Amino acid sequence: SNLIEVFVDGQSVMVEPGTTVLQACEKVGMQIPRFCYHERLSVAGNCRMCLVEIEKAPKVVAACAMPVMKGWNILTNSEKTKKAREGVMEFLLANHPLDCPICDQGGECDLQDQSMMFGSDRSRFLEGKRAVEDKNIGPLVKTIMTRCIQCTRCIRFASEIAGVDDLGTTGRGNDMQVGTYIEKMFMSELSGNIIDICPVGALTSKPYAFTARPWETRKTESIDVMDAVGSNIVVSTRTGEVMRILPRMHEDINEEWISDKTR
Amino acid sequence: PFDNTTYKNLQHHDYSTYTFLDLNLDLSKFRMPQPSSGRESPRH
Amino acid sequence: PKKTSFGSLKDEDRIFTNLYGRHDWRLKGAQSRGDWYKTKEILLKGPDWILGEVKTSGLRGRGGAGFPTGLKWSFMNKPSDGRPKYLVVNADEGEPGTCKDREIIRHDPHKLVEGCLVGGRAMGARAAYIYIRGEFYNEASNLQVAIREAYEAGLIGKNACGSGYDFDVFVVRGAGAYICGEETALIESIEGKQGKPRLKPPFPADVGVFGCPTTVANVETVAVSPTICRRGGAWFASFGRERNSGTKLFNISGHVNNPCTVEEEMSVPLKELIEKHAGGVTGGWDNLLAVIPGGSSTPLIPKSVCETVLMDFDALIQAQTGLGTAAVIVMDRSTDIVKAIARLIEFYKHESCGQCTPCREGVDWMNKVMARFVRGDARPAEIDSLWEISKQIEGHTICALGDGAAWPVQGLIRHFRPELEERMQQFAQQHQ
Amino acid sequence: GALFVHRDTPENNPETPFDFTPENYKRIEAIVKNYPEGHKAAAVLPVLDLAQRQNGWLPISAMNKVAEILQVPPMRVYEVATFYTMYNRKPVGKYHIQVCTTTPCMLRNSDSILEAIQKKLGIKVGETTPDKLFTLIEVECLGACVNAPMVQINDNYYEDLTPKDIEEIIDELKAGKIPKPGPRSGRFSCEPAGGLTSLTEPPKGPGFGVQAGL
Ligand SMILES: Cc1cc2nc3c(=O)[nH]c(=O)nc-3n(C[C@H](O)[C@H](O)[C@H](O)COP(=O)(O)O)c2cc1C
Ligand code: SF4
Ligand code: SF4
Ligand code: SF4
Ligand code: FES
Ligand code: FES
Ligand SMILES: [K+]
């Protein structure tokens, strides 16, 4: 009734008012690249990896944040869209450390996998990289903040879901840093969830450090029994041993979060 | 009456650190009542 | 009929009659110079009439973008829901080379304060927040003193000018961030957060300061509104070419004999502006290397183009640059043009807010490359690499600062590539 | 040069004594009433600056105080202090010399002004003299480009400087007095040196050029 018709690569899709370009593309099975957007956090629109071309529009729009207007044709695979992604991926990897072998995120990194699919295959950065100081926010989350890509997922999660306004951005420009400024431990019952939402190896699990790589773990879908919520989990095993516990999505029980005791 | 050889803006030579806020405080009596969103803060 | 040459504006047609502070800036000096005259009639005329006068006036924003003011101010001329409506006056002048807004505040404060009321009445706003950068402490105090005089005279506040319209004027000081000149970063700073621009949509006219409808107008764009309403839109539109009408404030700075701020008609040829008001280039017009027509954000142009180029939005677009804030930065042949523009990239690296990737990581990247072009510690194949890097920042960023960092580099490569490659050849010979 | 992480030190920590004077609490009450009810966080920038004017700089205790007065989480105050450059998170000299060095001031030999101060005070850029009297830093455009190399001391602009003139300002500041602010080359403002080129006729009084309808 109140749906409006938009086009994704020419294919018609009916969407509700206020639906974003990123969400319109989901209905046709297309997943726009992303680093800062999470469907359970507020929109930020800072990583700029979701830039997509709209036919007849000179300027690329941010799919995560741009509401889709009636009659728009979203070009998710045009040259302008492909060049936009390679440009953003080039900037995103410019100051990034060559830590993949020693980084716990290697093999399940949203920066690695979107560099292989949407970025360029080589570097033209001839300068010196930027290194940053490491914060200590507790005995659960290990912070190697040279890997941070300033996406602010942890900031929005710690604030909107855990209700703890202890993480923020200090500095400005290329020296902007995510942290607590003061020496403070991020100890909430949901603190361990910033490990998952962080798309890079900046925030990893200290108990799990260096113990496994994602490809070699076997995934068993089970139920948490630490409380009466019955959270759905994934039990990661390797060679007969339990390596870690990850959340498993369930919209009606736990969404994609678990408590620290469960984790 | 057409004196144009004098810089008629010299008051600021004597302004002090708290000059700006003192003027702001003196203006509070003229302000109209502020609007209210309906809550004491976004966190309430 | 329509004019063919522009310039030589008469003092009988200059809006800012106290641009140099030679008269009394306080009230009763502004009134003697035509301010606060017959303001009640303008307010009682109606918001539609005021907007109609600004639309016919052809006035365009003096902040650096030059959008049609009359069209923009009509977005707030809509039915008022429960939320209040504000007007934000952008006195955060921080664009390198720009000083016009500093003079309006410290010498003609009552023109700005009247413009707030006239602009507010057009937009149906309840109050005006004037954001002025924190380094303009003395200027902000002058503005605050003038606002007190207006309140005591009944000009603003309860029943402004006897019009029956309530309007407050608040002055808010920034804390030293050039990015807070952006219309959405300025709003965030007023709300007590970091000066990080928002994405659009929503536009400030639908969701702005405190989440309420808002319009961000530059100091010059507002200070001229009362005069336009008094003298009509026809008088203001009679200046400059079509779609470039009005009288503009210019800041000639750099390598000139008499660096000054002066008001001059739109479309005035750049050569006439420099020679007539600034006393020519240092060393003679033949000693001119390049000019930045509208502050650092605009790309430079060489001597060959300055001889027949008019100073207006349309004329400078055909020259691969922009009018910007009408700040003219002149560089003579003794200047190190590569180092002049490299320091401009270093400026943007220091003012980038860090929010978004292409400017947090790109403008810093362009800084390091430029710092190696000054010394020639690069090979010529990097010039085209620097051209592409700039094109990946331009239009891929949240705000226009990322475009403002790319454009200076593009102008340098466009008009001074031989100087770049010569510099690298010198370095290669020595360190062979 | 300025780190953005706070490590506690004896002179800077949550226990360092800070509290607004009774006079400032009256000023804060006027500031907090410039904004709609329910948006007190809008007062962070003014109040956080008012703390610096009283104290000269912002220790970690000063930030925590503004957080509780406005009822905002302390981190949201740390973000503002670290974002803006006019906030001093370390002690500075009572005279903070800020020499503009952006291109328009650079083209008019602002390097000579910088050399003049470094020789006279014997300090490098970013250092404080060994008497807590002067601190020197380079800053971006201060909005006075039309004026030749200019500096800012605290709240005053000293314009059209030359290496000779800037040294006099330091001498005048050194003993007891506050030098007059503004150009130091015979000008008064942005006016063109060598005689005005515009606004040379008596300004027209009220009611001039007014259209018939209005
Ligand atoms: C990085 C940056 C800095 C800006 N600084 C200013 C400024 O200092 N003063 C101003 O009036 N506009 C400035 N602008 C332009 C504003 O975004 C916006 O165009 C202006 O506030 C609208 O006023 P107008 O109607 O006069 O054009 C800046 C834009 C950017 C991207
Ligand atoms: S975060 Fe990803 S790209 Fe960066 S070092 Fe770790 S695995 Fe490699
Ligand atoms: S630490 Fe991770 S989640 Fe937080 S801003 Fe950096 S990349 Fe994003
Ligand atoms: S372009 Fe630069 S200044 Fe503008 S929002 Fe992005 S990071 Fe901030
Ligand atoms: S996913 Fe849209 S800018 Fe980050
Ligand atoms: S460049 Fe120095 S005041 Fe503008
Ligand atoms: K992670």
Give A-chain residues touching D6 at CB under 8 angstroms: 181-183
In one letter, which amino acid is A150?
Q
Residue A75 Cβ inside 6 Å of ligand 2? The answer reads: no
3-state secondary structure of A245: strand
Give backbone dihedrals phi and psi of C82, rounded to 5 degrees, phi first. -60, -25
Contact at 8 Å (CB) between C85 and C76? yes
Q: How far is B36 from chain D (nearest CA, A)?
A: 5
- Is the sign of the CA dihedral D12, D14, D16, D17 positive or negative? positive
Contact at 8 Å (CB) between A179 and A199? no
Residue D49's closest CA among A52, C137, A114?
Answer: C137
**Candidate from B2, B40, B41 with C-beta closest to D202:** B2
CB count within 10 Å of CB A39 equals 12
Contact at 8 Å (CB) between C380 and C421? yes
Pairing of strands A51-54, A73-75: antiparallel
Protein residue whose Cα sits closest to atom 5 of ligand 3: A152
3-state secondary structure of D135: strand
Estimate to the nearest angstrom the gap between the alpha carbon of C174 and the chain centroid.
17
d(CA D91, CA D56): 7
Query: After which residues are there C–N gaps above 2.5 Å in chain C?
Result: none
For A75, half-sphere exposure in the C-beta direction (CA atoms, 13 angstrom radius) is 15
Residue written as token pair 């990850």: A246
Give B-chain residues touching D35 at CB under 8 angstroms: 34
3-state secondary structure of D142: coil
A/D interface, count of CB pairs below 8 Å = 44
Decide if B39 touches D, using CB distance below 8 A: yes
Residue C2's closest CA among C308, C235, C232, C241?
Answer: C241
Residue A13's closest CA among A57, A66, A74, A60?
Answer: A74
D104 CA closest ligand 6 atom index: 1
Cβ neighbourhood burial of A245 (10 Å; 0-12, 13-18, 19+)? buried
Query: In terms of CA atoms, which chain D residue is nearest residue A135?
Result: D5
CA of C186 to the centre of ligand 6 (A): 21
d(CA C287, CA C334): 8
Give C-chain residues touching B35 at CB under 8 angstroms: 84, 126
Residue written as token pair 């109609």: C52
Q: Which domain holds residue C215?
A: 27-238
Name every residue whose Cβ is closer than 8 Å to that of residue A58 and which is 6 or more positions away in sequence. Answer: none
- The response to whether A36 counts as a known ligand-binding position is yes
d(CA C69, CA C245): 12
Contact at 8 Å (CB) between C300 and C327? no
B neighbour chains, 3+ CB pairs within 8 Å: C, D
3-state secondary structure of C204: coil
d(CA A42, CA C109): 41
**DSSP letter, residue C76:** G
Which parts of C are annotated binding residues for [4Fe-4S] cluster?
A: 353, 356, 359, 399
Protein residue whose Cα sits closest to atom 3 of ligand 3: A198
Ligand 1, pocket residues at CB < 6 Å:
C 61-65, 67, 69, 90, 92-95, 179, 181-183, 216-218, 221, 399-401, 404
d(CA D193, CA D147): 10
**Candidate from C135, C190, C255 with C-beta closest to D143:** C135
Contact at 8 Å (CB) between D42 and C213? no
Say which ligand is closest to the CA of C96. Answer: 6
Name every residue whose Cβ is closer than 8 Å to that of residue D160 and which is 6 or more positions away in sequence. Answer: D147, D148, D149, D150, D183, D184, D185, D187
CA distances from C173 to C130, C138, C141, C292, D72 (A): 8, 11, 10, 29, 20
Decide if D197 touches B, using CB distance below 8 A: no
d(CA A113, CA A107): 8
Query: In terms of CA atoms, which chain C residue is nearest residue B17?
Result: C137
3-state secondary structure of D61: helix
**Candidate from B4, B15, B26 with C-beta closest to C148:** B26
Question: Residue D136 is encoded by which pair of tokens?
Answer: 């020197």
CA distances from A246 to A35, A137, C43, C226, D150 (A): 20, 20, 64, 64, 60
Mutation target among B7, B10, B30, B36 for the C interface, most CBs of C within 10 A: B30
C393 CA closest ligand 4 atom index: 1
Question: Residue A3 is encoded by which pair of tokens?
Answer: 């749906």
Give B36's strand partners: D37
Say which ligand is closest to the CA of A214. Answer: 2
Question: Residue A232 is encoded by which pair of tokens?
Answer: 């759905």
**Candidate from D39, D146, D208 with C-beta closest to C191:** D39
Give C331's strand partners: C290
Phi-psi region of A112 (alpha: psi -120 to 50; beta: other; left: phi over 0): alpha
**DSSP letter, residue C171:** E
Q: What does chain C come to in residues? A: 432
Calculate the CA dihedral of residues A10, A15, A17, A20 and round it to 10 degrees: -70
Name every residue whose Cβ is closer than 8 Å to that of residue D185 and which is 6 or more positions away in sequence. Answer: D148, D160, D162, D165, D193
d(CA C301, CA C324): 14
Question: Residue C61 is encoded by which pair of tokens?
Answer: 């924003």
Residue written as token pair 């990893």: A204
Contact at 8 Å (CB) between C174 and C134? yes
Pairing of strands D134-139, A168-170: unpaired
Q: Helix C362-374 vs helix C401-430: angle between axes, to the nearest 10 degrees?
A: 30
Residue A89 Cβ inside 6 Å of ligand 2? The answer reads: no
3-state secondary structure of A61: strand
What DSSP element (H or E) covers C254?
strand C247-254
Give B-chain residues touching C106 at CB under 8 angstroms: 9, 12
Protein residue whose Cα sits closest to atom 24 of ligand 1: C61
Task: With CB atoms and an 8 Å threshold, state whether B37 touches D35.
Answer: no
CA of C407 to the centre of ligand 1 (A): 16
CA terminus-to-terminus distance, chain D: 59
Give backbone dihedrals phi and psi of C388, rounded to 5 degrees, phi first. -70, -40
Pairing of strands A241-247, A232-238: antiparallel
Contact at 8 Å (CB) between A242 and A235? yes
d(CA C386, CA C365): 9
Peptide bond into D206 cis (omega under 30): no
Which parts of C are annotated binding residues for FMN?
A: 173-221
CATH number of domain containing C109: 3.40.50.11540
Residue C331's closest CA among C294, C359, C279, C289?
Answer: C289
d(CA D77, CA D57): 15
- The response to whether A25 counts as a known ligand-binding position is no
Residue written as token pair 């030059």: C66
Percentages helix, strand, coil for chain C (3-state, rounded to 5) are 45, 15, 40
Say which ligand is closest to the CA of A106. Answer: 2
CB count within 10 Å of CB C380 equals 12
For C75, half-sphere exposure in the C-beta direction (CA atoms, 13 angstrom radius) is 18
**Candidate from D8, D60, D79 with C-beta closest to A168:** D79
Name every residue whose Cβ is closer than 8 Å to that of residue D212 and which is 6 or more positions away in sequence. Answer: none
**Candidate from D43, D101, D152 with C-beta closest to C192:** D43
Which parts of D are annotated binding residues?
A: 100, 105, 141, 145
Residue C172's closest CA among C139, C202, C133?
Answer: C133
Peptide bond into C201 cis (omega under 30): yes
Estimate to the nearest angstrom the gap between the alpha carbon of C183 and the chain centroid.
12
What's the Rg (C-alpha) of chain D?
Answer: 22
What DSSP element (H or E) covers A203?
strand A203-205
Phi-psi region of D56 (alpha: psi -120 to 50; beta: other; left: phi over 0): left
Name every residue whose Cβ is closer than 8 Å to that of residue C364 and which is 6 or more positions away in sequence. Answer: A173, A174, C349, C352
3-state secondary structure of C431: coil
Name every residue whose Cβ is closer than 8 Å to that of residue C158 and which is 6 or more positions away in sequence. Answer: B30, B32, C166
Phi-psi region of C341 (alpha: psi -120 to 50; beta: other; left: phi over 0): alpha
Give D-chain residues touching C250 at CB under 8 angstroms: none
Ranges of H-type helices in chain A: 21-27, 79-92, 110-118, 153-160, 194-197
Residue written as token pair 């200019």: D150
CB count within 10 Å of CB A101 equals 6
DSSP C357-422: HHHHTHHHHHHHHHHHHHTT-S-THHHHHHHHHHHHHTTSSSSTHHHHHHHHHHHHHHHHHHHHHH
d(CA D148, CA D167): 16
For A66, half-sphere exposure in the C-beta direction (CA atoms, 13 angstrom radius) is 22
Task: With CB atoms and an 8 Å threshold, state whether C107 touches B9.
Answer: yes
Decide if B20 touches C, using CB distance below 8 A: yes
d(CA C301, CA C316): 10
Name every residue whose Cβ is closer than 8 Å to that of residue C1 and which is 6 or more positions away in sequence. Answer: none
Task: With CB atoms and an 8 Å threshold, state whether C354 touches A45.
Answer: no
Say which ligand is closest to the CA of D105. Answer: 6
CA distances from A210 to A97, A108, C164, C318 (A): 18, 14, 72, 59
d(CA C399, CA C349): 14
Protein residue whose Cα sits closest to atom 4 of ligand 1: C181
CA distances from A76 to A21, A22, A48 (A): 10, 10, 14
3-state secondary structure of C144: helix
Contact at 8 Å (CB) between C172 and C128? no
d(CA C387, CA A14): 41
3-state secondary structure of D123: coil
Task: With CB atoms and an 8 Å threshold, state whether B23 touches C168.
Answer: no
Helix-then-strand count for chain C, H and E? 17, 12
Residue A50 Cβ inside 6 Å of ligand 5? The answer reads: yes
Contact at 8 Å (CB) between A60 and A38? no
Decide if C220 touches B, using CB distance below 8 A: no
Say which ligand is closest to the CA of C399. Answer: 4
Give backbone dihedrals phi and psi of C57, rounded to 5 degrees, phi first. -65, -20
Task: With CB atoms and an 8 Å threshold, state whether D26 touches B25.
Answer: yes
Estimate to the nearest angstrom the gap between the alpha carbon of A190 and the chain centroid.
17
d(CA A30, CA A20): 13
3-state secondary structure of A42: coil
CA distances from C182 to A144, C89, C137 (A): 33, 12, 20
Q: What does chain D come to in residues? A: 214
d(CA C44, CA A51): 47
Ranges of H-type helices in A104-221: 110-118, 153-160, 194-197
Estimate to the nearest angstrom the gap between the alpha carbon of A50 and the chain centroid.
12
CA of A35 to the centre of ligand 2 (A): 13
What's the Rg (C-alpha) of chain C?
Answer: 22
What DSSP element (H or E) covers A178?
strand A177-179
D101 CA closest ligand 6 atom index: 2
Residue C346's closest CA among C327, C323, C369?
Answer: C369
- The response to whether A109 counts as a known ligand-binding position is yes
CB count within 10 Å of CB C259 equals 29
Residue D117 Cβ inside 6 Å of ligand 6? The answer reads: no
Give me the resolution in angstroms, 1 decimal. 2.6
C184 CA closest ligand 1 atom index: 17
Decide if C24 touches D, using CB distance below 8 A: no
**DSSP letter, residue D204:** P
What DSSP element (H or E) covers C43?
helix C39-45
3-state secondary structure of A69: coil
Question: Residue D129 is encoded by which pair of tokens?
Answer: 């003299």
d(CA D16, CA B7): 46
Cβ neighbourhood burial of A206 (10 Å; 0-12, 13-18, 19+)? middle
